[PDB]
Symmetry: none
Subunit: 112 residues, 2 copies
């Protein structure tokens, strides 16, 4: 888009009514094209901004999903860790009884 | 209700800008109405460039804001996958230990019956 000082210069060249009609129409073309392109680019950058805001919110919502999924996973892992410890104790106890009964069987086998 | 412009008007519409351009085309136009029309274009353009610059800087901040949000989302999703994989591993080891305990329970009864039979043989 034209800078305000360049727009002003076109305005001041158009201030002379003695200006040649070829440069008069040329300057009028400059303002016309510049303004049409300006409104187009303005509208373009406007919708770009509204979409970028939706882009932010979607990213934040994908972050809300991810952080909550992680937290649930961490809690479930801790719960299973507690349950695993209990089961390890049961297996250790059952292993010791297996050894005890293995020893008892050998004694019985030697006595028969 | 634009507050960048004179009055509550917003930017000139392309047809209104064009009408002013066609008023400056008249060689009979009064020099006072020529200066008036040039003033219209001047005020409108300065006010429009002001609002344009503001929405311009707004865009760069949303762009940095997007990437920071997406990268904090990349992190969060990576954290979640790490957590879920650890949860899966804990589930597998818990399943293995539950299988081991069931096996040992079956073995205990088997040996209990064996002991009884052997003891009855004494």
């Amino acid at each position: 888009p034209l800078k305000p000082e360049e727009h002003e210069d076109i305005l001041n060249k158009l201030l002379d009514p003695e200006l040649a009609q070829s440069e008069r129409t040329e300057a009028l073309q400059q303002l016309r094209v510049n303004y049409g392109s300006f409104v187009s680019e303005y509208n373009d950058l406007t919708k770009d901004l509204s979409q970028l805001q939706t882009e932010v919110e979607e990213a934040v919502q994908e972050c809300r999903n991810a952080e909550e999924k992680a937290k649930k996973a961490i809690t479930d892992a801790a719960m299973m860790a507690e349950e695993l410890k209990k089961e390890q104790d049961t297996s250790a106890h059952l292993e010791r009884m297996k050894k005890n009964m293995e020893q008892t069987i050998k004694d019985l086998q030697h006595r028969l």
